[model samples]
Target chain A: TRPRVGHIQFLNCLPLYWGLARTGTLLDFELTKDTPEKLSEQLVRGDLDIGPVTLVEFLKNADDLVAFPDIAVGCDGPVMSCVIVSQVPLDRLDGARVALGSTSRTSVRLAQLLLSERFGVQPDYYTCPPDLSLMMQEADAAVLIGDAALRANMIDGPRYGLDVHDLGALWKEWTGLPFVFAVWAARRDYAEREPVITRKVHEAFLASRNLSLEEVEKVAEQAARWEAFDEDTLAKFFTTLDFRFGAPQLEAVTEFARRVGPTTGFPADVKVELLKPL
Target chain B: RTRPRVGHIQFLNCLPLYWGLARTGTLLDFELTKDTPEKLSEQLVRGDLDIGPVTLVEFLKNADDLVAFPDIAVGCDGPVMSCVIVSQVPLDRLDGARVALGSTSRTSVRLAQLLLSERFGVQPDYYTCPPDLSLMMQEADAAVLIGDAALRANMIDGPRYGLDVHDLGALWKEWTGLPFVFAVWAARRDYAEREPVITRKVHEAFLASRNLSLEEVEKVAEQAARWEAFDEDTLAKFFTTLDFRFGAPQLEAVTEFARRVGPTTGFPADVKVELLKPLE
Candidate 1:
């Protein structure tokens, strides 16, 4: 039986899938696209064998899952669409009402850290529909991710007179480190039992990332069909994002774990664990 | 000896204000110079231009040296669509983010800071730069753009950059439930005193021009499109969004802004609009 693999249906994730589809690289797996939150849930439910899960989610289930080394979605500076749209400056948001986006977990945690630690402001946060207009109606600001964030940035934000703060840029500026938002992981038990499948999946994603980078314009063109973003913007966004999982990337993830450990119910010295092939 | 020098910004929002005066030859008594708001503010301060729609902050800062036209202003009760904060992130999350503010229009820039500090509680690291959405977004997390560049950014670069645009006018309305005044016609105090009849004629000409432009918006829009490179429909909608009359509500909004932005921008906290006296 083909393994069930999960993918996030965001423009950022297009490169991986676009390469796979364009090249007809028929990995022995059934591909499915869903929000990162939903895909993480599917992995937990044993429905997905392997997928790119939110970094925090993978860390939370570290004992049950194994991560693929050297592949992630991260940025050294501003990650175009991950942002907070607000009515006021961020530091002044102490005790102000805020709405968190439904589709993002890593961003939600990052926002919490930035607000509490960096800005010295604690805001009351509530989950709201990812619509910028709707979010602003209930709270002073809203967290938006993926296409919704991009659309809000380009359209609604200017119309409504809202301020946008890029979370990745903030994180980088505050810590002088890149932010690793997502990483590929699999169920430990499944990976151990089906080592061949796990290896193949990892290799396939790595190859896809390589190919996607080589044909970025083509990937952006394909992405424009579904995402509201224009081709050049999408192309630029892809270039800004880094997918390689290297030593430096690992350090960034480790730094995240160190800072977010206490808030995320992990030990203060949480360490990342990678899967070993049998 | 020369026609009284008048200055205006090369922006779509100010098109209607100048189009009628240029076309009807109603203001043949003046020589018009097109420039940025910053330049116009400087010219007005240096006594180079007899009159221009000075940025509200500039007028307030130079209140002792300037007097405003009582019946003409540029502002909006809701979304202005021409002065905006375009960002990739939500406003509240921008505490330590870098924001590039447009170099033009001191009033809008000050308004951006006020809204961020007073309303959103975010004090981002921001600097004034030329308005270019792509460069701004690339260099900073967000950008505060104004005038024609802002409108164009919303229509063209917005989707391309996946930016979130926040209108300064809309933000003011949300915070204070009132309009936001961006610019006002002002004359140097000495000039107004020396050319009382000329100032009166200039004010009357502007009022008449505004009336004619409103009556023939399509023609004005078409004329603006030729120079601005924007479609007539877009210009028409932009004109509708602007509230040009200096009525009671506009005065209230201007006073509120003066009171709010004055102390921050180094003007007296109790700054009040000093208007040109009505013709005798």
Candidate 2:
């Protein structure tokens, strides 16, 4: 059987996957689409040979997994997909019900951190599904990720005159470091058992990630499975998405993990060990 | 920018996330697969699935190979109805008794070990085997079962099987006054660091999709609930009460548990993520 691969079912990875499809790099493995949390569990369970994992998931199962930190999804300023839409002002969340989306482990925690640590508010927080309308129905503020988060910030927030807090932008503005949402990972055994495939998988993704940018229009059209996912919108969204996992991104991820650890019980200064090609 | 395939579980507890994602029109954006924690855990370790919820004990055994999310978990403050050790004998009286720890779980299995050793200061002859209640009861004094099997035994089959249900989560929380973390969402390390952009974006979608379910649990439960074993409210209770958030308490709980069972379970003495910039 082909090596199993975890595929995030969101449009955010369109460029990278589009590249793979174009280059035929997608054919070397069997693919499963899932959420970041599911992917993390899959990686830990050895269900998935490899997939991009949330740092939260990575740390929870840190000892069993190896990461490819060289490739990443990060941003220096704004990340349209990770946003907090609020019915009330950020500071006014004392007793209000703040709905937290249940997926995207890191983003959910990031929202909690921003709300409690940064905003100095402890709104009665309850995790709910990531529906802005419904979450807002029962709560005053909400944190969201993926396509819904993007729509809330770009369209819904302005139309409804609501507040939109871009978590990536806020993180950068506060910490002066890029916000790394996730990185690729695989079981250590898989990496060790199939060294050639491990590195090849790494090589293929980088190539695919780059190709997404090279032919943005083509990818945008394909990714545009939605009428709203037009070229211009995809291009702008792409601009907000940074693919480099360099020193700055590393610092951001470390900072995030460091801050997140106390809450998540991540070991002090947990390292994001990279796979080969060092 | 291609589709990153991902999905996991149809457990009633996790359905809100999936249902909301589907209603939000985002499920179509993913390559979905579903399975039990045991199967998923094995697949993750085998490198068959890319990402999913890992059994806590399994994650520990393969600690070097996985990375957990900062905050996301399947945990409970008390009474994990789905995880139990149905003993034919009393707690303190389990010494010298044969306990069949379900191979279906590592986290609960170890928890059972800790409870017997630390709580009661008693030791039992433990062995690993699949959750075959009839078979296990035929040979052992007690059996540790998780998920649906445990639930069935605790609620329906316990009497017929002539066994007493001991909620492992309840016992641990009662003793330690801490939540029990059963699993964590994780990603394969190499893949996590290899494709940064895809990883990040996929993570965003996952979080977004997962959060959508909680806000509409009632609706999701009655209208579109995949598992119809019980009433909607009961299902909602299971979904809501199941502490899926990972944090200090849960982390500390895992740490506390690992501390107790790490030695016995063969968890490494000290395992840390290898980040060059380790705090300062």
Candidate 3:
């Protein structure tokens, strides 16, 4: 039986999918595109066999999932899109209401960690739609991710004159580690039952990532055609991201898990289980 | 009669702490000498400085002999803009690279080690040298610059040299989710015990000076601008980024730092901050 795979529709994930689409080598699986939050839900519900889900979502269902060993959407510093546009500086956010992006789970947890642990400020957080204008109107600061955040940085920031703080940049500045936003994971039952198919899918992802890196400019051009950003901007965005999950990435993931694990009901010593590529 | 001698860091970051003390005619009660964090640490250890804002590592190493002043510290929650690692290559690509550290600060060097080895998963060889960005860069793949030198290198030389500057404070905040306390006011426990009245007066004077500096930020900026070549606007922003209060958050950050750096620095894991009590 063909596997049902889920992919995020945001520009950030365009490079990963672009290679898959252009290569036409691994087209047997059924593919669905949606937001990270939606993809995560689909994976947990067993609606998709393999998908790139948010790090927080993977931690929440670690017992039921196995991740691809060398695949992720991570940035060492300054992920321009995942940002918090604030009316005041971070230190003065005490007692202020924050509007969190409805489509985010990992970024929300990260924001909470920084606010509570680092800044020593506890502000009420409420979920808001991805519209920055509406979010700003409802709260003092607004958390935006994916394309909305990119658009806000490109347009809303200069137009509305908001103070934009990139969460990835903030995380890097704080930890000196790359922040893994999403990881390609498969449901454990499916992987165990269809080991051959899982290996094939894993190989296809690696190939796709390799191709994407080689043809970044081409992928960026394709991404620009679909998104509002120009080719140059998309190309620059690709340069900032690391597609392979290496030692630094693993360390970052473990540190993140350790910090947010207790609160999210994940084991403090939880490690990423990778399905070996046979 | 000879007055108490205090060692102050000759950097813009500590300007606010010393601004009022320098201006006040009450300078008669205390003698202040300007030096780097390294010199100050050695001075405090060798009985040259009765009190000084020693770097965190030195304080931890000599915790048994020193007591921190209550309610005073220097730290930052996010990008400190100064204390930075300017490198020819990116952070992950620094695995086998040689990193030149600034000789002025011990805390920043340790912080860099923690970030690189623990977070970045790279173990680079480290060596200490004077804070000359060009010279350090020529000698090593990366250079850790602190204080005004770091600021100047980041703003002026970074782009010119095409170097990637990583803020050490920002890295610490990201990894540990806490502010990075670089230094704290400390005095020898014996001195505090024998001269409790003098210690109390010194603490009060420094605290008063901090408050005055905060209230008169522009004036402090102007005063700092005289010695440092940085613009007044930049100095003002730099001052706002620094947290001078040794509150719960700062204490938590300091404790967390001690826990991480203890094993490497020969400090016991259960190291705790011992505060000097003001005499009645």
Candidate 4:
């Protein structure tokens, strides 16, 4: 009878939570904060009704989960937060070992897609903690995401002189479309059975997202406390991310699914099925 | 080795059938899969389901590998109040217009196109957006509404901005003096041969369900009223209005639809309508 919602507890999503908390919109929802991967697992296990999940997780569970339209964690270009930082250039990593950040789902697969499809080289990859120094010490490069990637860019990249390639920028440079990462999704059973609540959640988040986008500078200041980055850096991160879901985003998602879906072992007919606008 | 799975579509049109199954419900009791019409169609084709109600286009496109359940379907003999186009402009001026189609259907999506292209000869751009009339009016010149969505919106607000409602079922009937069949109960040819006894059990269950629901249509309508927005009377009328019994007229309509929209992509443009053979 009660609705459960999850939050991606990272600086990238600070605006959404900031809006919800300020506007008191989350009172009706039983909200929990966790990493994106944990949120995806929670949704799959019926612990959460709706939450932000990676593109691959959505596709993997499209039959069971449906997404909110016009709502996603994506960027048109230069998603400074999700990148493949390499000691050597990207082309030189033929048999190079790449350490993938443990807290990622779609970005890890995207790293492989960029490596195998874009640069035509298969790099050996393994999961490791989000430590820039320790990761590159063993592996030639690493796939970093969310705050970890931003933290690396803010401090380590300048000091270590690593080649940080933003996956969103590379994807757009290759496909000429915005790259969608994690999208807001709810279990299909809940969405179908509790449409009123589902719609309330969808509209609520859309309003929050809209509110957050308008107050980007304010949100950045709020993020500075927890993120420890300057307001300008946080503000730039907020501006670089695209939250709108529409024709362009849908096309971008479909293209991504088509390219990355098969090898990932999802059915051939996997679509970016969104919750119907009831 | 397992119980055969059957597809069940939950809509106003299928209430009688649904209620019938509820009343004498046990044949596919352990494995009756419920979902939208399109999802059910996909499940049936992918072999995830043994049988279910599929759109006419699906029946045409994959007729070779399937057979109809015989004498049962969802269709209309006259005007279908549930499958329609509420256009902002006149029918003749729909060329180059942005039209929206509801996400819950398949046959009606193609039907609207056939009525527009073959009947009116206008090539309007189409978008598979959901049927939100207020939103459709904002961005689209016309929108095709199916199922309860069609019942929800009409030429209600006095046809402002040149609004017009064109009933696709009526148009198809007028264009070809036959009933428009929307969904047909189709079984996989392999499933039938493998589990003939179970197939018969399912067939009889549906036949009994269809008959039982029609006899107590008022109760079905009232049951629908508890969940839906509309009252018992309107839903009762919907239950009574749609023709669920497939006959020669319905067969001819399905065949005609296949001819126009058939010779489908991978399958032949034309195929024979093969009904379920007598089990007794």
The DockQ value obtained for model 3 is 0.00
* Docking verdict class for candidate 1: incorrect
- Candidate 4, residue A269: Cα displacement in angstroms equals 56
- Candidates 2 and 3: which is better by lDDT? 3
Candidate 4 CAPRI category: incorrect
Question: Could you tell me the lDDT of residue A249 within candidate 2?
Answer: 77
TM-score of predicted model 2?
0.51
State the lDDT at A201 in candidate 2: 83
TM-score of each: 0.50, 0.51, 0.49, 0.50
Tell me the tens digit of each residue's lDDT in model 1 across B131-241.
877788889998898987889877767866677888888888899999878888998899988878878878888888888778878876765554465787888999987
> What TM-score applies to chain A of candidate 2?
0.95
Please provide, for model 3 over B1-280, each residue's C-alpha lDDT reduced to its tens digit, 9 standing for 90 to 100.
2467888887878866665564432233555677899999899988988988889888988899998987888788898877999999888988888999998879988999899999999988888888998799888999898988898887778978788999898999889888878899988888888777778878888888788778878876764554466777878988988878887888889888888879888887678789877555
Q: In model 2, which runs have C-alpha deviations exceeding 4 angstroms?
A: B1-280
Cα lDDT over the full model 2: 0.75
Q: Which ten residues in a row have the lowest lDDT in candidate 1 chain B?
A: B22-31
What's the lDDT for residue B198 in model 1? 76
Tens digits of per-residue lDDT, candidate 2, B20-119, equal 5554445445555677777888887777765667888888888788777655677899988888998888889989889998877778887888888888
Residue A131 lDDT (model 4): 84
Q: Which candidate number has the best TM-score?
A: 2
A84-197 per-residue lDDT for model 1 (tens digits)? 898999989999999999999998899999999999999898986688878887898888888888777776777778888888899989989988899998898898898887
Better of 2 and 4 by TM-score: 2
RMSD of each: 25.5, 22.5, 26.9, 19.5
- Docking quality of model 3: it rates as incorrect
Runs of candidate 3 with Cα error greater than 4 angstroms are A1-278
